[PDB]
Design a protein around this nucleic acid. Structure first.
Ligand SMILES: O=c1ccn([C@@H]2O[C@H](COP(=O)(O)OP(=O)(O)OP(=O)(O)O)[C@@H](O)[C@H]2O)c(=O)[nH]1
Lengths: 133, 239, 157, 357
RNA sequence: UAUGCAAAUAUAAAAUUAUAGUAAUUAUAAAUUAUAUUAUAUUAUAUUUAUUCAUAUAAUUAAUAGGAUAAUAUUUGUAGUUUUUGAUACCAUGAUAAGGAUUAUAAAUUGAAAGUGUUAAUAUCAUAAUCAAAAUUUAUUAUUUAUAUUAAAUAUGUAUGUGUAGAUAAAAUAAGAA
């Protein structure tokens, strides 16, 4: 009777240091010896978890434009996603790309330290978006 | 699956479970440094004797004193069991540690007519030598208790000076496993909730942890643990 | 996750952090969104340099850029729900279930004042307190006095 | 009351209780505190000094007349924090064609030091012939009595370290205290470059000699870069020098040894591409560095991991153990009595109870 | 509704019940507990105003990490998967509200402690949470009435019908009431 949110995980350091470092005990946190963070998630699980972070306008949301499911069940009534080609007919296509999201350094100060308009706040310190890398 | 060594039950086999983070007095978690590689009397065991430790004198100082002596530095050779001692350290005077407690109580002439030399005047420097520097440290304790101004211990003593192997006060660094239960003297009761809490003493303590710690050499360390991992009796996430 | 070893007593307390993050996003986007909105719908000529087509084309392009800005904080402040940071209880600003100075709900305020957790002074329930401006004109008068102290006091350069 | 804690600074009830200062009582400072004056910590920064030169300086200082005369030639040689990208053979040819003309030993030495620095920056190994042509005959040969300038010797050491040359020992032994005695004037950057070069070259005795000389001359181990120390300590394999490294590793600070372990781990793992030349596998040194860092660092408490396999005493847990040996205590008592001599020595004892397993 | 047929509490007694065998004593007393002002006398009560009352949505909560004018750390770029299990879609102890009937003029306030969703020990599939543009059926809510009527976040198309049944709400405090 064992249940688990994630059925598979991967380590951080590869097979060049851990085989020698295992002989030295590590003082893990006493009240939670086993830890399982986002940097320890598998590729698919991490992707599907990161898609659900944004409230809307994100891949996790069923109707945000970036979904991948063929159909979505809504109130016991199936519905079919209108493809991008069919949307284009009556929705004019305006798309600049990654250049639109980014803003110049001179405007970074006015934008309060942000050069990206992405709805996830990007921080330049190497500690907040701290995956394995 | 669940195990008696993985669940959180407070009491195992009738005694307080030592595997609970909440079953230990908070002062145990405080950071501390390993001291098993330090001097025997500098280790944490002699907490009540730490305030009485003597100062140092090294091989360079001892050789310099041997080459160029000075009139007011009494080099006391506090070695017992005269059958063991063979050579004579230069400028040395024999005051055994088993007699120092009464010897320091004698007057000037009272000490001179019994030991063949006068009192160190309680102001001149005294430097104590013994095998392994154990009896010398124990004697320096007594000298400091008698309030001598300058008492120095030569760690290593005649053993390291002459390159012999004499071990006075034969003591083993390792300890026999604690066959009995957890002593009552280590049981801590909370001052507010009145809960019974443990302490790093008796069956489990810092000396046991240090002596159980891994060896510095990798090829020797691999000999202890079996193949395929050093610790496999425990789950993957608890190692 | 999924209520496995939860540390906080209430799950909804994380919505306070989410609201703080949305406020920070508003801090980022409040200038760019306002500038784009101002430029897009200004019918009068900007200046001598840009007039006619050189202005209308620029307005269309800046509106296209604003639309392409993914994640821009469009939502106004008054439509963002206020949730207490102590017990994660929702209150709407403008009613009595939310206080502006402490940013906590009516229930949290009552609990904190009934216990000792917030140094406040008691006044009559059916009066205007002790403030001279409140006695003089009331909520609107004190609001205008705050405006006067902040901005209208200064002879701007 | 409750799971949420109460902050005593904001809560007036705590601040006005009998364990703090009531508002009716006079508000005044009590027991003024001086922490920064009784014991002031030195400034240790987590981030490295951003404005640091981060290189070996040559202390270029010649007569102004000679400097301005050689200015057309010296434009190609590196200046202060400015490195021209002229080919090294061009400056080598200029030196070998113009050095006899200028009559000044100090100026020639400074010019050759700059040539060595430039060719070291370009990693051009062909310039040792210049040393053999000019300096070897009089500065270090069959008991040479000359005193080379500090700038020239430092530049030559930098060049040999950059090119991983095998001729550095003949100069370092002269630079010991019994010879030129230029060791105390070597920068920590020079020491780091020497250690990194020797670690890459895999010299077992060079690392030991350099570490001992650094300790003797009070080189700043903490300011010596961690990567150079890691590379130097990776190459030791012999038992004697390994023991020397083991006993010498205690000289470094706790933070220094921790970051040495961190750099060693990351470099032999993920940071293998950081080095231009991959580091050889030395599991003995890796394990010893990790173990030494663990020893030096403060020890935390992990009771579950420490006592996972802990088992209580037989007598202590007899009531809670269905199948436990109790006659073992009687056997131990009998053995103790026999050792004491109260019981007959080596008396035959038969089993007192059945064996239930 | 006394004419006959009919000894009968005004007491010479031996713990209850029972045919004088059934069970183990039996009865009784006192204190306290919400029903009854009296007609000068610790207060004259008696007037004005009002009543078509409605809203909730698209799921992941369990780490510390410092930068210019500072005597030097690449710590540039800090890298050890996996043995636990409740405030969640029931339940998972306690705690604040509303509710005026007798301590009054006087140098004075006309709002109560008896408890109101969220808060501190019982567990044992629980991902129910706003960041806009959204779905009355639900006791507890003062709306503008007939000269001039929709411009800035998008903001109400419904019900003209003799001030009109039943039922019901509010006020004796800078107001005017005996
Ligand atoms: O402390 C550090 C960190 C990083 N690096 C990086 O190492 C790269 C080259 O890799 P190496 O550092 O292995 O080469 P090297 O021995 O020739 O390096 P130098 O002594 O000449 O510097 C360089 O391009 C630098 O960015 C260091 O050299 N040192």
């Amino acid at each position: 009777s064992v249940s688990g949110v994630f059925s598979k995980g991967r380590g951080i350091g590869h097979e060049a240091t851990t085989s020698i470092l295992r002989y030295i005990p590590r003082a893990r946190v006493p009240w939670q010896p086993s830890r399982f963070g986002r940097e320890n998630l598998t590729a698919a699980d991490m992707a599907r978890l990161w898609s659900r972070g944004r409230y809307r306008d994100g891949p996790g949301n069923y109707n945000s434009g970036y979904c991948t499911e063929r159909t979505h069940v809504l109130e016991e009534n199936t519905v079919s996603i209108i493809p991008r080609r069919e949307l284009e007919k009556y929705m004019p296509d305006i798309t600049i790309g990654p250049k639109a999201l980014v803003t110049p350094v001179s405007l970074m100060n006015a934008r309060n330290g942000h050069r990206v308009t992405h709805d996830l706040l990007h921080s330049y310190d190497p500690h907040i978006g701290r995956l394995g890398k | 699956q669940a195990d008696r060594r993985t669940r959180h039950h407070m009491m195992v086999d009738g005694q307080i479970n030592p595997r609970e983070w909440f079953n230990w007095h908070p002062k145990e978690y405080q950071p501390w440094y390993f001291d098993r590689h330090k001097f025997l009397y500098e280790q944490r065991q002699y907490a009540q004797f730490h305030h009485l430790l003597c100062h140092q004198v090294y091989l360079k100082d001892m050789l310099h004193l041997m080459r160029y002596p000075e009139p007011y530095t009494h080099i006391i050779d506090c070695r017992t069991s005269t059958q063991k001692m063979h050579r004579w350290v230069p400028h040395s005077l024999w005051l055994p540690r088993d007699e120092v407690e009464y010897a320091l109580q004698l007057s000037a002439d009272e000490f001179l007519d019994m030991y063949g030399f006068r009192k160190p005047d309680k102001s001149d420097d005294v430097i104590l030598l013994s095998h392994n520097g154990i009896y010398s440290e124990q004697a320096g304790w007594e000298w400091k208790k008698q309030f001598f101004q300058h008492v120095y211990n030569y760690r290593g003593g005649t053993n390291e000076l002459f390159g012999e192997s004499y071990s006075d006060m034969n003591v083993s660094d390792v300890l026999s496993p604690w066959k009995g239960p957890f002593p009552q003297s280590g049981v801590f009761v909370d001052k507010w909730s009145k809960r019974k809490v443990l302490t790093r003493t008796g069956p489990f303590d810092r000396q046991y942890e240090m002596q159980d710690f891994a060896l510095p050499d990798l090829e020797l360390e691999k000999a202890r643990h079996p193949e395929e991992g050093p610790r496999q009796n425990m789950p993957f996430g608890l190692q | 996750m999924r209520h496995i070893g939860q540390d906080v007593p209430k799950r909804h307390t994380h919505f306070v952090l989410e609201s703080r993050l949305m406020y920070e996003k508003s801090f980022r986007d409040c200038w760019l969104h306002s500038v784009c909105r101002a430029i897009s719908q200004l019918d009068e000529p900007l200046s001598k340099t840009v007039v006619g087509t050189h202005q209308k084309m620029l307005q269309r392009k800046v509106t296209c850029f604003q639309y392409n800005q993914y994640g821009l904080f469009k939502t106004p402040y008054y439509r963002l729900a206020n949730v207490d940071r102590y017990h994660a209880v929702q209150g709407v600003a403008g009613t009595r279930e939310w206080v502006p100075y402490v940013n906590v709900s009516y229930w949290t305020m009552n609990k904190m004042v009934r216990g000792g957790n917030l140094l406040v002074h008691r006044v009559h329930y059916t009066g205007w307190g002790t403030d001279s401006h409140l006695k003089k004109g009331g909520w609107e008068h004190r609001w205008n006095k705050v405006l006067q102290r902040n901005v209208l006091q200064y002879s701007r350069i | 009351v409750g799971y949420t804690p109460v902050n005593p600074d904001t809560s007036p009830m705590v601040a006005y209780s009998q364990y703090h200062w009531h508002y009716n009582l006079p508000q005044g400072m009590e027991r003024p505190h001086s922490v920064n004056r009784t014991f002031a910590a030195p400034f240790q920064s987590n981030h490295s000094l951003v404005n640091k030169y981060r290189g070996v300086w040559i202390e270029f200082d010649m007569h102004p007349a000679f400097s301005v005369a050689l200015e057309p030639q010296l434009r190609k040689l590196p200046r202060g924090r400015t490195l021209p990208k002229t080919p090294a053979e061009e400056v080598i040819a200029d030196y070998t064609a113009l050095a006899p003309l200028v009559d000044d030993e100090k100026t020639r030495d400074l010019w050759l030091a700059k040539v060595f620095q430039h060719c070291a920056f370009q990693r051009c190994g062909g310039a040792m012939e210049l040393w053999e042509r000019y300096c070897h005959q009089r500065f270090t040969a069959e008991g040479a009595t000359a005193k080379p300038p500090l700038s020239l010797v430092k530049s030559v050491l930098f060049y040999c370290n950059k090119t991983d040359n095998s001729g550095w020992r003949a100069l370092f032994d002269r630079c010991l205290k019994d010879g030129w005695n230029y060791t105390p004037l070597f920068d920590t950057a020079q020491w780091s470059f020497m250690l990194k070069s020797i670690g890459r070259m895999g010299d077992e005795d060079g690392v030991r000699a350099v570490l001992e000389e650094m300790l003797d001359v009070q080189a700043d181990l903490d300011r010596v870069e961690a990567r150079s120390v890691v590379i130097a300590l990776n190459a030791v394999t012999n038992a004697d020098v390994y023991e020397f490294v083991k006993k010498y590793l205690f000289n470094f600070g706790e933070r220094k040894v921790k970051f040495l372990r961190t750099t060693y781990s990351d470099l032999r793992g993920h940071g293998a591409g950081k080095l231009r030349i991959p580091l050889k596998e030395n599991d003995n040194m890796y394990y010893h560095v990790c173990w030494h860092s663990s020893i030096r660092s403060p020890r935390q408490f992990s009771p579950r991991q420490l006592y996972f396999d802990y088992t209580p005493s037989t007598l202590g847990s007899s009531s809670h153990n269905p199948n436990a040996k109790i006659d073992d205590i009687v056997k131990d008592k009998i053995e103790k009595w026999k050792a004491e001599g109260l019981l007959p020595e080596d008396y035959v004892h038969e089993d007192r109870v059945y064996d239930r397993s």
